[PDB]
Amino acid sequence: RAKAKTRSSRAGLQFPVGRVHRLLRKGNYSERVGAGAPVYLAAVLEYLTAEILELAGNAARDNKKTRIIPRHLQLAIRNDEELNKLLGRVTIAQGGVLPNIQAVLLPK
Amino acid sequence: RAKAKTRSSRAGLQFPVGRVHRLLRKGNYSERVGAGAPVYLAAVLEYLTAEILELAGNAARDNKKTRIIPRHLQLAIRNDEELNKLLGRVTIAQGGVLPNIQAVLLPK
Amino acid sequence: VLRDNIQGITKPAIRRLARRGGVKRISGLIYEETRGVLKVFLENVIRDAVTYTEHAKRKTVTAMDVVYALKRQGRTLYGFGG
Amino acid sequence: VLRDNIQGITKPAIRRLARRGGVKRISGLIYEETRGVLKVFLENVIRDAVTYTEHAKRKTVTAMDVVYALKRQGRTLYGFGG
Amino acid sequence: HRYRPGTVALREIRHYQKSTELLIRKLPFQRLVREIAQDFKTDLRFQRAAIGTLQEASEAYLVGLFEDTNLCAIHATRVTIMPKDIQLARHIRGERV
Amino acid sequence: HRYRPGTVALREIRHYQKSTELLIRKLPFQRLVREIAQDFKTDLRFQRAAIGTLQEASEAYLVGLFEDTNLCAIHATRVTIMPKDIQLARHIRGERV
Amino acid sequence: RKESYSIYVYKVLKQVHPDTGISSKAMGIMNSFVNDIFERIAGEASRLAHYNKRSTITSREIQTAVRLLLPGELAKHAVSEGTKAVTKYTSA
Amino acid sequence: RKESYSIYVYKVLKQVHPDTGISSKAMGIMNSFVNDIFERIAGEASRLAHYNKRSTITSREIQTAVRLLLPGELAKHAVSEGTKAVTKYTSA
DNA sequence: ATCACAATCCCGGTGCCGAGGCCGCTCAATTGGTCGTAGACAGCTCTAGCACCGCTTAAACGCACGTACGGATTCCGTACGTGCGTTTAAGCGGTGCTAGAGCTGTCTACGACCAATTGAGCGGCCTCGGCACCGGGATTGTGAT
DNA sequence: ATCACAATCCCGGTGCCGAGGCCGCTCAATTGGTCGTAGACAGCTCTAGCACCGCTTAAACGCACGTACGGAATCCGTACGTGCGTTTAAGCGGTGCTAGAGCTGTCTACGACCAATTGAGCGGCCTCGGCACCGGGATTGTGAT
């Protein structure tokens, strides 16, 4: 036998290709699962995770914070158009809201 | 070997138990399908069909017609509160709308 | 190549659609706004329908592609428009 | 037998919820209407959650039952509360 | 002799809420659909029933939107629907605004 | 000396939109949830996380509803939200009304 | 050789309103309705099975999914019909 | 022994923000997000296989589901990343 | 523009509890080989989508005209917001008791699988019955008289 | 209040095409036997949900007071709706051409499955450091002047 290599490392990914394949097989999605489908799915999931964490880290740094909290994820999602469109029907627990006051309610 | 008898006739149904069982089995819904599940599902589908057809036939007879058309189905659905809740995100082709004029727009 | 067909949705057609919705008086600026809204809705539905068509390796958009695309938007349609 | 706990949703709490919504001025009839709206929302979520609990043959409503019920309502929730 | 403003409008409301036929003409709508579709793929063909289904869905969507818009206009104590009414109705529905 | 009406309201809006904590007290909400649930099944138990999750979802729902209600009140050229604003917002959203 | 519920819908129509016909457009509407309700119930039953780590869809899953999907009076009457049909089928 | 994505989310986080941490509640949010996107993509791919009478979910179905679900530039970049990963995997 | 002062931002200076690292091991991922079938691909037929054209007539368009409606203005009465002293009950931390959630082991009934039988459903053909249309008449409904 | 007359309901009378009935066949449903395991049930542990209670102190409540806002009434001016003559292009029917939808047959590469191997991740413990909070101090936002 050759030295074992994870399929994630073959595809250059951090998300686990094997676990994605196992979840696809056991989820009653189809009778058979092709070889490239778990790789493609892991790649897409990793990309979306990276996008959200980059935006949330920027939001955390803007507040001089080191750790990301749910508020930073909420700010990242609601301030970015595509993420706000994808996550439109989603509530973030302890995310709060975007600061927004209607102009007619301001003084003078 | 006895004479064949349909599972619909055993359960006293008009909807086909065998076709429902085959559709459940091939729909990637679960690994296994119980004996009573298609019978129960067929009974429920038949009951809902009968409920809708009764209301639509009442509407057609109220319109002095002997044939049910999509307008009658739309009238029956939108006038029954339960069916309106069930079919609230559904568009009926050629169904039209419920006649409704707001009171403020009426004359004098 | 087709161009500027949104104006084929005429002012009287929009008036008829408003009448079926119970509208009694219509502002003059409503017609362009309605055209914009229709163009956005159609763009989304048609993009999804063409995605379904392309996945099937077809060159013809079927009515079933349109019914799936409408089911994606949360706009389930019973029957077919003909 | 608990009774009339809807008044535990006090007027100051409703005012805080409206302030997070950006409301500046609140009519006096808003509080009872808000109580009704909240009761209806809770009734529909709790009915679905109790259904999920009873299917599992459990006697204890878990957080996951509530999460699934919110997913029924089209109210997907990420994370959890305490 | 002539009718007061709104009498013909009310008659039209009763007539069009009574009926079920398509309110947009078929050839202009078909041209619009093909012009939109040419941006996503070139040399696309359509079944007739596909364009018919698209028109049915579009007209239903527009009629529902006009119902909501009319509610907004009445809420403002007007009887004329205005673009701000459409904007409000679409925002509350969660649409692309 | 005394603040004019609306200054404290604008301060409160800024404060509560800055924060993320729960705005309904926990014990009354938990009593409400238990009272509602007794009508579906007697002698139910609740995980604490279950009630917490319910409170988070409920407060999010009410805040979104109040945002839509505020839009309706402003559409009517008002600065005060009224029950009719809530009714219109819920009707446009597709709720039970 | 396409599959439809047309003959069964017609049978139910003949029981419910014996003298009433139906147009082919209305029969297409009915077919769409039957297929949509089927997909809703089956998907909710599948989710119920997956949540509880079960591998079989039984009448219990169907009953729970119907209670989840159907509102109010409809759910109670449909549950009554399903239970009655299962009981009659088991005694056969 | 429940399975979550915390270790891979943390790895990606250190890839994009080396100096940035994350709290456990934000990590729970991230786990919910990954699970939700997985369910959406897999369900759309299963529908695509069923509509075309195919028994196998391949990378084509995943790509079409990605185009159906993700809006705009997110879809374009996600498709690019998936294609690159599959190309790298095939040459291994 | 001035002035008072409450609210708000800024800069350290700690505590504390949770984020993050370390380690043993077990259980899921990986490797290699065998086999059957899913689907990729080619080739063929024949449907249905597109182009185009000429006529007819319903629909659209442009314009005149008047009035109904939208929007601005004013006025007023009270229902709201703000502040403060008093009462309430939420939150917290501790304790005790037990329902029931989660797990493990046994075994058996149920559902998959398969081969043979067979009858229900579907496609095509055919013929009348429901329903839209038309015209002549009575009903009713609107706006100036 | 009345009337002309326009919109609308009644009452039949031929057409006409779609509904619905009928028949042969094929392919999906049924029946009977075998067997593997999913799950029903029992029994056990020990987690975590519930009840109760006493203190602290923040929040809720009730009331006074004043003014900002909602609602009503008035007015005006112009942008709507309605009617009519002219233009436009939709709809229809027919003809012709061909792209491509749908099906069938062949074959082979891919994915399932199984047994052995091993390393990735998970739970548990441990420890420092990020952040919350507090207090002292400077700034500014708000209201009367």
Residue numbers in the entry:
A (entry chain G), B (entry chain C): 11 to 118
C (entry chain F), D (entry chain B): 21 to 102
E (entry chain E), F (entry chain A): 39 to 135
G (entry chain D), H (entry chain H): 33 to 124
Quoted passage from the original study:
In the present study, we reconstituted the nucleosome containing H3.8. Consistent with previous results, the H3.8 nucleosome is thermally unstable as compared to the H3.3 nucleosome. The entry/exit DNA regions of the H3.8 nucleosome are more accessible to micrococcal nuclease than those of the H3.3 nucleosome. Nucleosome transcription assays revealed that the RNA polymerase II (RNAPII) pausing around the superhelical location (SHL) −1 position, which is about 60 base pairs from the nucleosomal DNA entry site, is drastically alleviated. On the other hand, the RNAPII pausing around the SHL(−5) position, which is about 20 base pairs from the nucleosomal DNA entry site, is substantially increased. The cryo-electron microscopy structure of the H3.8 nucleosome explains the mechanisms of the enhanced accessibility of the entry/exit DNA regions, reduced thermal stability and altered RNAPII transcription profile.
Histone H3.8 is a non-allelic human histone H3 variant derived from H3.3.
